[PDB]
Design a protein around this nucleic acid. Structure first.
Ligand SMILES: [Mg+2]
Ligand SMILES: [Mg+2]
Ligand SMILES: [Mg+2]
Ligand SMILES: [Mg+2]
Ligand SMILES: [Mg+2]
Ligand SMILES: [Mg+2]
Ligand SMILES: [Mg+2]
Ligand SMILES: [Mg+2]
Ligand SMILES: [Mg+2]
Ligand SMILES: [Mg+2]
Ligand SMILES: [Mg+2]
Ligand SMILES: [Mg+2]
Ligand SMILES: [Mg+2]
Ligand SMILES: [Mg+2]
Ligand SMILES: [Mg+2]
Ligand SMILES: [Mg+2]
Ligand SMILES: [Mg+2]
Ligand SMILES: [Mg+2]
Ligand SMILES: [Mg+2]
Ligand SMILES: [Mg+2]
Ligand SMILES: [Mg+2]
Ligand SMILES: [Mg+2]
Ligand SMILES: [Mg+2]
Ligand SMILES: [Mg+2]
Ligand SMILES: [Mg+2]
Ligand SMILES: [Mg+2]
Ligand SMILES: [Mg+2]
Ligand SMILES: [Mg+2]
Ligand SMILES: [Mg+2]
Ligand SMILES: [Mg+2]
Lengths: 69, 79, 228, 151, 131, 330, 59, 32, 59
RNA sequence: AUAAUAGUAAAGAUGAAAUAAUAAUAAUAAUUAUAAGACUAAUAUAUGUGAAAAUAUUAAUUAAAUAUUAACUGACAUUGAGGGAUUAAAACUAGAGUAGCGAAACGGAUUCGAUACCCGUGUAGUUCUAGUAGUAAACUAUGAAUACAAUUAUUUAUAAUAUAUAUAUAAAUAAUAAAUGAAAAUGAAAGUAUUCCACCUGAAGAGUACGUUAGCAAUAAUGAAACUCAAAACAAUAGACG
């Protein structure tokens, strides 16, 4: 019932403090915040702040535009 | 163009390493050591990347003043 | 008709002060972020001297790698200069430098940034910039509104200056290129103005079918015939 | 060097619409003198190996089993046509190579298709499937769809 | 203005896959330097296949060599560089992103700054002292 | 007292970017209609596009010939084409449809040619200086540089290796308006004009004002190409046939409005008399008391149906024809 | 596993929605209503958890 | 106002529009 | 001009150290009105203005 | 929508059915490949931003934007009649464009009828570029500014006790005490006050009629009186109905 994934809390780069937009050329890192099909998880799932989520989605969508992801 | 061609040859040399972004590193102490050395030892810094204090000492004669002071105690005064 | 017409937005054409500031912003070797060429060059020379004699004195036992090519050091210098060159930066920096110059040329004493004349000079620089922008983005209605507001604010401060210190008021408005009417009449940047002063050099508004204007024009231009 | 064609895989594709269902069966085929030919380039040849051609062998809809008008799209009709498809695979004896399965839409026939596949009906065919996936079509914007229905 | 360019270059004549990246980088670097500009750094990313079979000018593509140039120049030059890249058949895709400079004059490429190293000075000091 | 910042220091390409923006503005620019005050009833519906960049002087005499007026009459002296007659004295201009020579040529001016509907462009070769006339495309203005590659890519680039085929700068050197190339080296989908039929023949199709065609397909094995013409017809053409990039100038020529019969008379158009107004011995529609069409199917004076009757029919049809024109679809 | 993938990617509901067109205003109102209902359900879950805990501890 | 009160005016405008549609020729003749 | 401050300082330093004292030394002597050459002369020539503000702030 | 292939007699639309689709390469299902003209999945809450209309596919150039202290100016401010600018759909005049959707129009069906709800073919529109016009349930049905009034929760930025996430400010959103109110409710206002600017004096006639101004045109602004009546409305209660 209380199975909480705190390993993700410890090991997540985004919640560390780094700027999500700084990773726009890292499809490997960004792929850990998208579904199998490529959709972006909601904030309730990702756990990121509002600012971090907006920057992360912004970076992801950009990566898609450039074609690296 | 000389720098351009030299750096291009070095980078696209096969023997040179190439970052694939497939692995990850295990985890700044050297940078902190440089900064703290420049923070405390000031104009006496021997590090490659000195700070503005060295130029300030030059324009103030502080370095030359101290150098002649110590040298005058050493060779003339035999101390 | 025989009086003088001054644009409330741009003022008299070819104002010496405005053209001089624009020329200053477009000189051979100008840098951004407040780096003057003489200071940067002599600072780099000081850096080289610093390293030279520091290595020589601390390393009386010769441990120095060697002397570096003067051409290589000049390459470093040109690198810095290309980084900091003004014409390689934004126009934000240009407006900032122009505002600095205007402040120093209108301040009553070193450090006066709140005097009405200095305020007016800074808003004049900003108005020039936004007018240049609108002239290429004529549909930018938000920025047109901002420009209108800024021009009206300049009018407000200049009216206060007229009410407080008339001498400085006249001095400043004449130096800028604005006349007392352009400072003391209603203004809206309407299509009427924007066509009369040819903001884009094109027609913007149409007249009603009533031809009374041409009627009076010709009835007063009948001088060639037997009228007066 | 002369052209020759041999089948490498097979693909079974099902589109389950709201009014009807379609099952198609195809063979992924490959030539082995194509690479023997000289002068080719690695990019071209391997692009071909990612885009092998396919030929349709069996193709049947629900109408071949006597279902007409409203009966075309329904659970039992899909079950029957799927069973007939599997009997066709068995009888034309193309079960030796590997099989793949793909499904395109979410009509009433979706459940029936795989119920037949994993039931006693498709017991023989299921033994050769290794990849199961869906390839439904969606719009990231796209063209406007018809208006609301005011039923 | 500092600009970060990410570029994908076609791979042909597999004998020298990096030859085309080399040539294109040389050309754009010459453009930048002759246009009163300075390339900050060029770093390759390696041979990597594309997420999808990507098509340009009726030519299929599956893999492309990736490279990243951080260079300082003006808006006009930036534009022309972008238009030349878009024109060039040697490039499949490319993008330029402005690297802000109001806070710091020295900014490392997005890749190192993602690693956590925020300055070319940091990189060079690490190379000199650690290695 | 004089003060001006003369330190332009424009970077090598910044001039190119500046002129690119200027080209964009001049392409955005539009053309207006001349409308005179209707002090007379004949001026009320007289509209004509005005191009302020056109050249007001005379043409080069060495490139013109006097245009002989026939009046619609053939070598027997009888009217064979009606409604054609007196008009303003004119000279025909020897304009080039082949563009064999090659090399770079600068457009000196753009002129009105009364013998056609499109404007014409005077050219001067950069190396030899010979003058020539060609059809001006839409964006052509005095000052531009054009070239023809009908002979082929030049040795100047082949030996220099800079613009040779290996880096494939030829694509961007080709798909630019004004120049002339074979369909073989024109890419698919390009809007072209002055299309030929044969590898050695002049440009024949898509030659009037505002007209263009599109390259739809290439067939190297059959040495052929499929082009869609302004009629909407897909047609086979020789793959090594001529074609120029860009639409033909004077797009607005169709919005012009002659305001009076005298203007048609000047242009050389005599009145047209309807068949119904005639007598039965004349046009079949003739006869009948009052206005009457006589229950006669609309037809020419010589008994040929004038509504939908395909005139080119039977064995003698177009051998080079993939698809017919819309024919009422539009 | 296929069923779970499509359910979690909301492929079926998306396909049902895209069949017909809806006005942007109606789309917005539907989005707001659905978000409110989900928010309310989460809050109700929390309150019920509090009730269960209080019962377990004797309140 | 309430939807009822709005309908009472909606009918007004509908009748006005029918009016202006049916008096088209007369209005044209009067206005030349 | 055909020369720069960095190379000029290099030339004067080389003259001070080795003692060559060529025609270029005289040229730069009139270029900066420096009748004599020494480390003090170099430092004085390259003096910065920031020191003045520092001292004034201290005062 | 085009062509290639291979494969067959159906498919595709309906609550259920029929018109415009289909075996003569021969249709839907399938894989390639060549095109176009709209829109922009998830993130996402319109959170935030903008004066409002509006705004969430990628870069760029330009144009302003938030908080602290530093200095400066020195009441330069609020409101704002007349005016001015912007103003969603739908409209209209010119170019291009027209895939999908779709007023009208013609046919299917359903009906006692069905000038409709359902289905087919689809014009004008919807798109871009120039412009004209200035209204919508243009709504928070709530004009702006200033000084104040009792409490809880969350998120936001910045400020440190100091071992470190425990501490301080303000901002927004939710629920309330007072207060107000016809009540529903509002709750930093629809409370306590102060200065302005736009409106209201019963329905109905009527935003109609006649001038007038403006627009290419639709149409917009301004806007009246006869003859009638004791009517006409809002909140909240019980119910009876679905
Ligand atoms: Mg003001
Ligand atoms: Mg059904
Ligand atoms: Mg339809
Ligand atoms: Mg005729
Ligand atoms: Mg004629
Ligand atoms: Mg006629
Ligand atoms: Mg006639
Ligand atoms: Mg007669
Ligand atoms: Mg006869
Ligand atoms: Mg008759
Ligand atoms: Mg009311
Ligand atoms: Mg199909
Ligand atoms: Mg989205
Ligand atoms: Mg909000
Ligand atoms: Mg006032
Ligand atoms: Mg007003
Ligand atoms: Mg809308
Ligand atoms: Mg139109
Ligand atoms: Mg319909
Ligand atoms: Mg308007
Ligand atoms: Mg109205
Ligand atoms: Mg209203
Ligand atoms: Mg609302
Ligand atoms: Mg307000
Ligand atoms: Mg205000
Ligand atoms: Mg109360
Ligand atoms: Mg009250
Ligand atoms: Mg009240
Ligand atoms: Mg009205
Ligand atoms: Mg009520």
């Amino acid at each position: 019932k209380y199975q909480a994934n705190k390993n993700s809390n410890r090991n997540d780069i985004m919640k560390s403090g780094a700027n999500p937009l700084e990773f726009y050329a890292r499809p490997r890192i960004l792929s850990r915040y998208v579904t199998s099909t490529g959709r972006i998880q909601h904030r309730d799932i990702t756990g990121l702040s509002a600012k971090n989520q907006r920057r992360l989605s912004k970076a992801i969508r950009r990566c898609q535009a450039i074609g690296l992801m | 163009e000389s720098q351009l061609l030299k750096k291009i040859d070095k980078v696209f040399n096969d023997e040179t390493e190439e970052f694939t972004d497939a692995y990850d590193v295990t985890s700044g102490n050297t940078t902190l050591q440089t900064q703290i050395n420049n923070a405390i030892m000031g104009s006496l810094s021997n590090e490659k990347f000195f700070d503005i204090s060295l130029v300030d000492s030059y324009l103030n004669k502080d370095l030359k003043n101290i150098s002649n002071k110590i040298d005058s105690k050493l060779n003339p005064t035999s101390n | 008709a025989s009086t003088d017409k001054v644009d409330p937005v741009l003022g008299r054409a070819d104002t010496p002060f405005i053209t001089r500031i624009m020329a200053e912003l477009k000189e051979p070797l100008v840098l951004s972020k407040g780096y003057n060429i003489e200071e940067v060059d002599k600072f780099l020379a000081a850096i080289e001297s610093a390293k030279r004699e520091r290595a020589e004195l601390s390393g009386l036992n010769t441990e120095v790698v060697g002397i570096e090519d003067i051409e290589k050091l000049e390459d470093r210098r040109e690198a810095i200069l290309r980084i900091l060159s003004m014409r390689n930066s934004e126009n934000k920096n240009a407006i900032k430098m122009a505002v600095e110059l205007a402040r120093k040329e209108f301040e009553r004493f070193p450090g006066d940034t709140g005097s009405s004349e200095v305020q007016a000079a800074c808003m004049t620089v900003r108005i020039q910039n936004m007018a240049n922008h609108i002239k290429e983005h004529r549909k930018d209605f938000a920025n047109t509104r901002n420009l209108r507001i800024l021009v009206q604010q300049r009018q407000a401060i200049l009216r206060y200056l007229k009410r407080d210190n008339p001498e400085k008021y006249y001095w400043t408005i004449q130096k800028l290129g604005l006349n007392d009417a352009a400072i003391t009449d209603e203004f809206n940047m309407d299509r009427r103005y924007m066509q009369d002063y040819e903001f884009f050099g094109d027609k913007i508004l149409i007249r009603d079918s009533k031809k009374v204007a041409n009627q009076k024009r010709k009835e007063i231009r009948k001088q060639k015939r037997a009228t007066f | 060097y002369k052209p020759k064609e041999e089948v490498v895989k097979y693909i079974l594709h099902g589109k389950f619409t709201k009014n009807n269902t379609h099952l198609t069966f195809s063979s992924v085929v490959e030539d082995k003198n194509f690479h023997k030919n000289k002068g080719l380039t690695y990019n071209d040849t391997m692009l071909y190996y990612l885009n092998l051609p396919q030929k349709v062998k069996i193709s049947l809809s629900t109408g071949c089993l006597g279902f007409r008008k409203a009966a075309r799209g329904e659970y039992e009709a899909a079950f029957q046509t799927s069973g007939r498809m599997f009997e066709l695979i068995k009888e034309k004896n193309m079960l030796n190579k590997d099989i793949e399965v793909v499904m395109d839409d979410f009509g009433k026939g979706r459940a029936a298709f795989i119920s037949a596949l994993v039931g006693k009906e498709g017991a023989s065919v299921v033994k050769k499937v290794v990849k199961i996936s869906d390839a439904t079509k969606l719009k990231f914007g796209g063209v406007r769809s018809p208006k609301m229905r005011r039923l | 203005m500092l600009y970060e360019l990410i570029g994908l270059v076609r791979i042909t004549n597999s004998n020298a896959p990096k030859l085309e990246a080399k040539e294109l980088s040389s050309t754009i670097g010459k453009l930048i330097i002759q246009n009163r500009g300075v390339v900050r750094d060029i770093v390759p990313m390696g041979i990597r296949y594309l997420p999808k079979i990507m098509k340009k000018d009726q030519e299929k593509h599956f893999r492309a060599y990736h490279f990243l140039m951080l260079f300082d120049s003006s808006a006009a030059v930036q534009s022309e560089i972008l238009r030349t890249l878009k024109k060039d058949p040697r490039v499949i895709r490319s993008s330029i992103v402005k690297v802000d400079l109001d806070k710091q004059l020295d900014r490392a490429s997005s890749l190192h700054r993602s690693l956590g190293k925020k300055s070319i000075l940091e990189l060079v000091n690490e190379d000199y002292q650690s290695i | 007292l004089k003060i001006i910042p003369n330190d332009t220091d424009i970077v090598t390409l910044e001039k190119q970017d500046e002129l690119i923006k200027r080209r964009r503005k001049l392409s955005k620019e539009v053309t207006q209609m001349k409308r005179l005050k209707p002090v007379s009833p004949g001026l009320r519906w007289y509209r004509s596009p005005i191009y302020p960049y056109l050249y007001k002087g005379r043409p080069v005499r060495a490139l013109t010939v006097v245009r002989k007026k026939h009046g619609g009459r053939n070598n027997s002296g009888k009217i064979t084409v009606r409604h054609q007659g007196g008009g303003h004295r004119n000279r025909t201009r020897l304009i080039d449809f082949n563009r064999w020579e090659g090399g770079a040529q600068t457009v000196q001016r753009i002129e009105y040619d009364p013998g056609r509907s499109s404007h014409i462009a005077l050219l001067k070769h950069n190396t030899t200086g010979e003058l020539s006339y060609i059809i001006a495309c839409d964006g052509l203005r005095p000052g531009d540089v054009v070239e023809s590659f009908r002979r082929g890519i030049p040795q100047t680039l082949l030996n220099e290796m800079g613009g040779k085929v290996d880096p494939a700068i030829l694509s961007v050197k080709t798909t630019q308006r004004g120049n002339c190339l074979p369909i073989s080296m024109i890419p698919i989908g390009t809007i072209i004009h002055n299309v030929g039929i044969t590898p050695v023949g002049p440009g024949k199709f898509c030659r009037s004002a505002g007209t263009y065609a599109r390259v739809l397909a290439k067939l190297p094995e059959k040495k052929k190409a499929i082009v869609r013409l302004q009629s909407g017809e897909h047609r086979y053409v020789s793959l090594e046939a001529v074609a120029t990039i860009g639409v033909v100038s004077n797009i607005d020529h169709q919005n012009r409005s002659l305001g009076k019969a005298g203007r048609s008379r000047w242009l050389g158009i005599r009145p047209t008399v309807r068949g119904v107004a005639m007598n039965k011995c004349d046009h079949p529609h003739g006869g009948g008391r009052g206005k009457s069409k006589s229950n006669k199917l609309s037809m020419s004076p010589w008994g040929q149906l004038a509504k939908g009757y395909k005139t080119r029919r039977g064995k003698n049809q177009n051998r080079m024809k993939v698809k017919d024109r819309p024919r009422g679809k539009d | 596993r296929l069923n779970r993938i499509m359910f979690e990617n909301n492929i079926p509901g998306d396909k049902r929605s895209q069949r017909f067109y809806m006005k942007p205003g109606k789309v917005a109102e539907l989005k707001r209503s659905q978000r409110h209902r989900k928010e309310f359900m989460m809050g109700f879950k929390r309150l019920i958890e509090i009730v269960k805990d209080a019962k377990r501890k004797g309140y | 106002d309430s939807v009822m009160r709005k309908r009472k005016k909606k009918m007004k405008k509908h009748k006005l529009r029918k009016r202006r549609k049916r008096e088209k020729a007369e209005r044209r003749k009067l206005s030349q | 001009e055909k020369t720069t401050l960095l190379r000029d300082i290099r030339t004067i330093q080389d003259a001070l150290s080795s003692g060559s004292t060529p025609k270029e030394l005289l040229e730069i002597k009139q270029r900066y009105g420096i009748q004599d050459f020494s480390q003090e002369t170099v430092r004085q020539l390259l003096q910065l203005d920031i020191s003045g503000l520092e001292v004034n702030l201290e005062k």
